Design a protein around this ligand. Structure first.
Ligand SMILES: Nc1nc(Cl)cc(N(Cc2cccnc2)Cc2cccnc2)n1
Ligand SMILES: Nc1nc(Cl)cc(N(Cc2cccnc2)Cc2cccnc2)n1
Ligand SMILES: Nc1nc(Cl)cc(N(Cc2cccnc2)Cc2cccnc2)n1
Ligand SMILES: Nc1nc(Cl)cc(N(Cc2cccnc2)Cc2cccnc2)n1
Ligand SMILES: Nc1nc(Cl)cc(N(Cc2cccnc2)Cc2cccnc2)n1
Ligand SMILES: *[C@@H]1O[C@H](CO)[C@@H](O)[C@H](O)[C@H]1NC(C)=O
Lengths: 217, 213, 214, 209, 211
């Protein structure tokens, strides 16, 4: 109790101590480079197709974007910190990848708190939920065959030389798709793509999110 | 008089002791789990959109939790037993609607009450848009919608939730609302998701309502 | 001539430095040190009355006045400066909130207060507010009636008390070509007990009766 | 080559070290000159009596605390700085219905003689009955601009002319301009004994043929 | 080793951004040339009730500074790096006829190279003044919007385009509008108000409802 109550205060200063050694000694990660490239794992959880505007060809999605990477600058051994194997931290305190939708028509709106989980192996998990408006012609949404749209996500300023992407599966997580949406999902896939762009030798990597959908009935 | 100046210095010194010569509490952990009490006061169903299945709520969200690191002896500070402070000065939980469709809009001052036993009360007023099919809203039966609230980043082993009651407080509901409320419940739930190893805790808010004639 | 202006600038930089730095920001009112805030509304316009959501949009000026010993000074010690203008963020401001707004209040004017050597502050932000209102009858002769309470969010009547100078809302800047004409507008102090709290809260209740301008 | 080191030094001299000006006072009043360049009447709403304008708002004033000698800082006659680095007047539309939207970078020009020029491009919604806009007579609206917290004893207004500059008015606008005037107006009230000043922007306009 | 490349950059950035106080901006004595290019992604919306058209595009900005160059061998063969656009000076290029504030679609990060050149490419959504009369015809509709520095005259900032053709190779295939032509063209003139020369890049786009 008084024992147990001291364990609590102790655990705190341990975390504060770790958060001090990490977030100062070697400062912020300066981003990846070709010498030390970074692999970012990307995955999508589709919650809702909120709106499909046929007068402007924009469709609004609500989804969670799963992001994972690993950095040696964020390694520590849980034995020098009271067995702290991980912590929560504000996402501003750390480097996060500049993953963007390439055909959005409005700035993304964030729906969850901007907080990541860092693990002692220097791995990071960050899952921002957002609402995205993107370019999409919903022709066919009101037929049996439905409509099909696609939006690519990838780094804005880092090529495949500095940032590699991967998905753990090519199936979009549909386990949280809102059952009463105006639209039913016929299928949703997320697929790693590599292209070259004539100019420049460097490759470009994106995860393409394709979605086929129709009015609910 | 030369009394109000003393009490003022006592408050200033108290806040200063708590925030400036001691770090912010880093949040809960497996070894230092936090229980957060939630209670909802529904003020208005402002709008129901059948074209996109979004409904807009205005409500007050009552949050309470208790930290050892915020405790003090009133006797060491001129008998002060509680004070107001900007929510930015302290740790606050990351309670989120899980089916919102727009960033939540805050309607009240971001200020919390801290009490000498280390308890905190924080009650943000909010407008929320969330996923809801209002089909049936123009019948006698009405429409029923649901929205979960819980931590985004902390499992049940770090943040636990409780309610004091399972009835949503309807005593402030706007009488001339376009919608009347048939019932409104807040219910703690523990659920396992494939994404994560640990059970997560939410409070489910289910509202039955209909067009007011 | 020109030397004078420099001096007074120095005097003002000095007064402000003394007030803001030789003692922190006043921590807010307590049960020991309660504050009375005086409120007056100037109704500029009813902009929108949406009957599909029961929301009415108002534009108004909100006069706020209060007074602190901690903002007092001797003008003789400061080149006879009797008052000054300063940013609302340099000072404590009351957390006065509309209890039935439906969207965050939008600020229309610069956030600047006037402090006076007697310790009194005046701060008049212009605002557009959406709040809960049933405009039914706005096309009738008697018109429509709405009410919205203003008061502190976090301070009870033991810490903050409100007051009006009149129960009459100032309509002298009401936009003469508004869609709506004002039949009456009142602002009245109320002592309210809510079942959520053992302490009474004080609010100013803004009652507006209005109808479509013909 | 060194001229970049002179700019740095000047900006440092004027800001860093120099006790930077606390705004105007009765003992030290300020004259702000105001001029509008009307770009477009974008929207006219008969259901809420709101009209939206896009314009450029030119503001000029002058401070001793910002004067310097050119050949004492390597012949520098002027510089650009962020609006946040310096003091700016609190000119506002007295009958807006929505917060103003800023359309231009918030950067001002400072000259060695201590003058500042600031020209924020803005979209403004304000109270206006557009009745008659589809007539030949047209519609008439007005909005006053001026300080919110400084009377005429602390800030005086001027204008270099009472004609609104229309040389950048949008040639294919929904609405054509019949007249646009910007008029200085001294105002004495009643609650108060000090004078007040505003610049009244009157626009007459109608739907384009 | 992989440890070491990282330390070099960190050191390199610190050298540029601490002992080297950033560029206070251009002057009549040392003017700056900024290269502009538009990649037109989509005409989202054409409002004939207010005469506003909404575009989504990428705006390619390129310029060059002595204060930003370095020798890659004094730093471990680092030839470029990325950095928050807030950490450096950027040009205040603005649409001159926008009706609403521009909305930023992409992260605000620039690429700086060892020769001192910078590339910054913000994706944007822009509403601007445009009477879309005839958008529903064979001829289609024509609109223009000028871009340029707000506070720097032709004496301080010069503008150049790479080519006169707007890049259309990323135009949305299923847009509500098809592009008939898109040009970007440097213009210089005097205005009556002022005596300095003014430079802008004028974006002209002809388009029509997709058939
Ligand atoms: N030369 C170039 N041109 C364009 Cl028009 C876009 C582009 N970017 C963004 C970028 C931003 C800042 C610095 N370097 C690159 C990468 C990109 C953009 C769109 C699709 N795929 C990759 N790169
Ligand atoms: N691995 C995972 N995947 C998803 Cl797709 C959501 C999720 N979160 C959010 C989260 C954010 C940051 C750190 N830990 C957890 C928890 C969650 C979200 C929604 C419903 N239930 C649990 N966690
Ligand atoms: N117990 C409690 N419950 C609620 Cl649902 C609100 C509340 N309020 C706000 C309020 C709202 C409406 C009328 N009077 C007061 C007071 C409060 C607010 C923030 C922190 N502590 C107390 N206090
Ligand atoms: N007595 C008083 N009452 C009001 Cl309703 C406004 C006011 N103003 C604002 C104003 C409004 C219209 C034209 N010129 C100025 C001056 C003011 C504003 C803010 C703080 N102190 C004084 N002063
Ligand atoms: N005298 C003056 N008057 C105006 Cl109406 C604008 C202006 N501008 C902006 C401009 C915008 C479009 C075309 N040419 C110039 C230049 C400027 C902006 C800010 C501070 N100083 C000069 N300078
Ligand atoms: C955390 O602490 C415990 C001691 O209670 C330790 O034995 C264990 O290895 C740690 N947990 C994990 C998952 O490593």
């Amino acid at each position: 109790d008084y024992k147990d109550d001291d364990d609590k205060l102790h655990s705190q200063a341990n975390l504060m101590r770790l958060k001090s050694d990490l977030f100062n000694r070697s400062p912020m990660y300066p981003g990846p480079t070709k010498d030390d490239p970074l692999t970012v794992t990307l995955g999508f959880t589709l919650q809702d197709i909120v709106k499909a505007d046929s007068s402007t060809n924009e469709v609004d999605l609500v989804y969670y974007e799963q992001q994972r990477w690993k950095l040696n600058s964020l390694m520590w051994d849980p034995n020098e910190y009271g067995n702290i194997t991980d912590f929560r931290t504000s996402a501003a305190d750390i480097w996060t990848p500049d993953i963007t939708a390439y055909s959005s028509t409005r700035p993304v709106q964030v729906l969850s708190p901007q907080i990541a989980v860092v693990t002692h192996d220097g791995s990071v998990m960050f899952i921002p939920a957002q609402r995205l408006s993107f370019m999409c012609d919903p022709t066919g949404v009101d037929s049996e065959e439905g409509a099909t749209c696609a939006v690519k996500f990838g780094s804005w300023v880092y090529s495949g030389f500095e940032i590699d992407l991967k998905t753990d599966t090519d199936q979009v997580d549909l386990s949280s798709y809102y059952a009463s949406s105006k639209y039913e999902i016929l299928s949703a896939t997320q697929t790693r793509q590599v292209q070259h762009y004539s100019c420049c030798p460097e490759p470009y990597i994106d995860v393409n999110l394709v979605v086929k959908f129709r009015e609910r009935r």
